[PDB]
Amino acid sequence: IIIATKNGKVRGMQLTVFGGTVTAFLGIPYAQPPLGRLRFKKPQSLTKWSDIWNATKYANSCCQNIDQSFPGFHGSEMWNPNTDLSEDCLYLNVWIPAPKPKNATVLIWIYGGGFQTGTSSLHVYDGKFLARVERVIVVSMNYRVGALGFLALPGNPEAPGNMGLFDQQLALQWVQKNIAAFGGNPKSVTLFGESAGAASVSLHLLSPGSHSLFTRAILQSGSFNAPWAVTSLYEARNRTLNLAKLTGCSRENETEIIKCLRNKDPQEILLNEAFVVPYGTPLSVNFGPTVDGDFLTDMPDILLELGQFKKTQILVGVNKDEGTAFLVYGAPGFSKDNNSIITRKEFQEGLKIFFPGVSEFGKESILFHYTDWVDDQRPENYREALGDVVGDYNFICPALEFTKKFSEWGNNAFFYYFEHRSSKLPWPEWMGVMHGYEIEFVFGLPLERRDQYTKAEEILSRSIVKRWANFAKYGNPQETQNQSTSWPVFKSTEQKYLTLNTESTRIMTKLRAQQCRFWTSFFPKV
Ligand SMILES: *[C@@H]1O[C@H](CO[C@@H]2O[C@@H](C)[C@@H](O)[C@@H](O)[C@@H]2O)[C@@H](O[C@@H]2O[C@H](CO)[C@@H](O)[C@H](O)[C@H]2NC(C)=O)[C@H](O)[C@H]1NC(C)=O
Ligand SMILES: *[C@@H]1O[C@H](CO[C@@H]2O[C@@H](C)[C@@H](O)[C@@H](O)[C@@H]2O)[C@@H](O[C@@H]2O[C@H](CO)[C@@H](O)[C@H](O)[C@H]2NC(C)=O)[C@H](O)[C@H]1NC(C)=O
Ligand SMILES: CC(C)(C)OC(=O)N1CCC[C@H](C[NH2+]CCOc2cccc3c2ccn3Cc2ccccc2)C1
Ligand SMILES: *[C@@H]1O[C@H](CO[C@@H]2O[C@@H](C)[C@@H](O)[C@@H](O)[C@@H]2O)[C@@H](O)[C@H](O)[C@H]1NC(C)=O
Ligand SMILES: *[C@@H]1O[C@H](CO)[C@@H](O)[C@H](O)[C@H]1NC(C)=O
Ligand SMILES: *[C@@H]1O[C@H](CO)[C@@H](O)[C@H](O)[C@H]1NC(C)=O
Ligand SMILES: *[C@@H]1O[C@H](CO)[C@@H](O)[C@H](O)[C@H]1NC(C)=O
């Protein structure tokens, strides 16, 4: 089966899914390979081809450093690239239902990974289940990460910043020009993403050049106002310079620095990325979105606060234990291979790791607000508190504050709190409902009865998949047939949200109220 696109013909492949068929187009190029003279620049439009492009395998993943903290462990290694790294990585995938749809809603996935890592080819991003089950079209794209995707010399078009975001945007563009040929409705496009993918989605809501490239948006465990999601022009330029020094590329002509960085091998840029921040951490967003005056015209907190964003519906949510995963990537006394009971002094040391440039008073105030124990003697008190600190600060309270503020400008918003721990989760139990482990439910992996998910999990994924698809098609994430709890609109006053679990889906109000008044109202002053 061959589809004629604006740039040439592309050949796909047939997939058997649940006694049905899905047509997959894996690895369609959507931009000139950003190579040589093109490294660090915005993505350039693709010159047509005459032949038939074979889009039958995932393309190259973009260059990136790899998580090597747990070699051989599926809990970490399932997130690492599963295709060759290359700078030639600006490709996208398309899953379409078979038989070919007539006017199908399109779902576009944007992966996370702190803007330093990630790839669309991961097993948990397989769109074939959504296409089969809900008859939507699923699109995902690779986008540049790290310095190669977000190196910033603001104003300088040789390295303007936000290239990876313009990569995402050129892909949304491609869907607008082409998806009708695949049976998709370019007027019914829902972006969805997780973590840095969700922050990306929220920034497309703010960027005028994306306003007309999509309809609705879903934000899973991420938003641009998260403290890790936007690099300051101060940090960015200090980081660009440190990368220059580290590679022998320091110059006075800012443009000649870039020319110098353009001759370095991709691996020399990767090696030196970690050290551009003196507070070196494997959790460091070394190179991320900036206020570039192109993609972002202003500081996004101002745009959010003053209503300068796309007026549409959003679906936003978080997981119960967003913070735990990060505790084994540097916090003292923590291990995935034991229950990580930590002392007060280990907790205090963990705050220093996660809040590096923060005053002593700032850290004491975190301790004060998170160590008023319901029981003094519980040995896991400090271990649980540090997880909640990292998750509330980095994910939950920014997503809640994003939703309140977005909804105050009159748009329907829906907030969820995912609290199911996957029965297959390879990480230990004290880690709970981890960051990233709703994704397989969203993509319908538990719908495949053959892979050891329980029956309760099949049903939960089935409902979630239905709610996501109804949100994308109809702006309203209900499951209307199986006497399901109705999902209320999130309002700035009521703050109602829906819990997602295998047992009882219920309606609650004002998630982490006390914790988020601390993080959102007080802590930004310290
Ligand atoms: C901004 O950058 C300077 C320079 O960073 C140093 O050089 C880089 C190539 C890289 O290898 C970093 O690890 C280096 O730290 C920072 O200044 C350094 O600060 C640390 C501690 O703050 C100090 O021990 C070093 O001696 C300093 N080096 C120099 C040359 O001043 C600076 O902290 C960075 N951040 C800010 C906010 O200014
Ligand atoms: C849980 O484990 C951590 C990590 O220690 C490593 O992993 C273990 C599973 C085991 O293989 C150890 O030999 C490894 O070193 C423990 O943290 C260490 O604790 C000891 C004594 O308290 C200390 O000397 C080390 O510096 C610690 N390492 C750190 C902080 O990175 C922790 O004590 C274990 N906790 C429990 C309750 O078992
Ligand atoms: C891949 C996925 C997004 C689904 O889940 C995860 O990332 N993990 C869950 C399990 C551990 C593995 C580490 N992830 C690999 C590299 O990802 C990053 C690199 C750098 C910064 C990052 C990230 C991710 C977030 N931030 C921002 C940040 C948030 C909070 C505290 C400090 C930083 C995967
Ligand atoms: C593109 O593919 C054409 C047909 O390939 C068919 O499907 C793939 C998956 C293989 O199983 C192959 O044996 C089949 O014939 C090729 O004939 C054609 O040469 C390919 N073109 C390029 C440029 O690779
Ligand atoms: C698809 O739906 C849009 C409205 O959402 C409509 O304008 C367009 O003509 C439709 N295209 C079809 C049915 O081919
Ligand atoms: C050097 O800097 C000048 C401005 O001072 C700029 O116009 C020129 O393009 C730069 N040269 C190169 C080779 O980039
Ligand atoms: C509704 O329940 C039926 C069983 O009666 C099940 O087969 C179906 O998948 C459910 N639909 C949704 C959207 O959960």
Give DSSP secondary structure letters for 267-279.
HHHHHHHGGGSSS
Atom of ligand 2 nearest to the CA of 333: 30
Query: Of 238, 331, 324, 249, which is closest to residue 286 (Cα–Cα)?
Result: 238
Q: Tell me the HSE value of 83 on the side-chain side, using a 13 A CA sphere.
A: 21
Q: Is 74 annotated as a binding residue?
A: no
Listed residue (161, 145, 72) closest to 111, CA to CA: 145
Q: Residue 76 has which token pair?
A: 């970490």
Residues in Cβ contact with 364 at an 8 Å cutoff, skipping those fewer than 6 apart:
none
Residue closest to 195 by CA, chosen among 122, 112, 119 = 112
Q: For residue 56, which phi and psi values (nearest 5 degrees)?
A: -115, 5
* Nearest-10 Cα torsion for 156, 161, 167, 169: -90
Pairwise CA distance, residues 222 & 396, whole Å: 8
Choice from 13, 54, 57, 58 to test ligand 4 binding pocket (greatest atom count within 8 A of CB): 54
Distance CA 462, CA 443 (A): 10
Ligand 4 — pocket residues by CB below 6 A?
54, 56
Q: What single string gives the DSSP state of each residue in 457-471?
A: HHHHHHHHHHHHHHH
Angle at 284 between CA 195 and CA 113, to 5 degrees: 30
Instruction: Evaluate whether 415 touches 498 at the Cβ level (below 8 Å).
Output: yes
Give, using CA atoms, the residue closest to atom 16 of ligand 1: 278
Residue spans of alpha helices (H) in 189-280: 196-206, 233-246, 254-261, 266-273
Task: For residues 196 and 221, give the distance between their C-alpha atoms in angstroms, rounded to a whole number.
Answer: 9
Query: Residues 438, 220: contact at Cβ < 8 Å?
Result: yes
Which DSSP category does 287 fall into? S
Cα-based angle 20, 22, 25 (whole degrees, multiple of 5): 165
Which ligand is closest to the CA of 157, given by its number? 6
Q: Which residue has the tokens 């106002």?
A: 225
Half-sphere exposure of 116 (CA within 13 A, CB side): 19
Q: Is 435 a known ligand-binding residue?
A: yes
**Tokens 């910033």 label which residue?**
152
How far is CA 391 from its chain centroid? 15
Tokens coding 413: 């918003």
By the 8 A CB rule, do 503 and 338 touch? no
Tell me if 390 sits within 8 A of 397, measured CB to CB: no
For the residues of 296-347, what is the DSSP string, one character each?
Answer: -SS-HHHHHHTT-S--S-EEEEEETBTTGGGGGGT-TT--TTS-----HHHH
Q: How many alpha carbons lie under 13 Å from residue 127 in its C-beta half-sphere?
A: 30
The closest ligand to the CA of 156 turns out to be 6
Pocket of ligand 5 (CB under 6 A): 103, 185, 187-188
Token output for 337: 């291979």
User: Are the CB atoms for 290 and 150 separated by under 8 Å?
Assistant: yes
Does residue 322 carry a catalytic annotation? Answer: yes
Q: How far is CA 6 from CA 50, 51, 363, in A?
A: 11, 13, 55
49 is in an annotated binding site: no
* Cα separation, 111 vs 21, whole angstroms: 25
Q: Which method was it determined by?
A: X-ray
Neighbours of 307 (CB within 10 A): 12
**Taking the CB of residue 490, how many other CB atoms lie within 10 A of it?**
25
**CB contact set of 204 (below 8 Å; sequence gap of 6+):** 165, 168, 169, 172, 191, 210, 213, 214, 217, 310
Q: Is 250 exposed, middle or buried (0-12, 13-18, 19+ CB in 10 A)?
A: middle
**CA pair distance 214, 192, nearest whole angstrom:** 11
CA distance linking residue 447 with residue 247, whole number of Å: 49
* Domain residue limits, the chain: 1-526
Q: Mapping DSSP to helix (H, G, I), strand (E, B) and coil, where does residue 118 land?
A: coil
Helices and strands, counts by H and E, the chain: 16, 16
Q: Do residues 222 and 391 touch, judged by C-beta distance below 8 A?
A: no
Torsion of CA 45, 48, 51, 57, to 10 degrees: 10
Strands 216-220 and 184-194: parallel
Rounded to whole angstroms, the Cα distance separating 243 from 150 reads 13
With a CB cutoff of 8 Å and minimum separation 6, the contacts of 259 are 158
Helix locations, 436-521, DSSP H:
439-442, 455-474, 513-517
Query: What end-to-end distance do the CA atoms of the chain give, in Å?
Result: 60
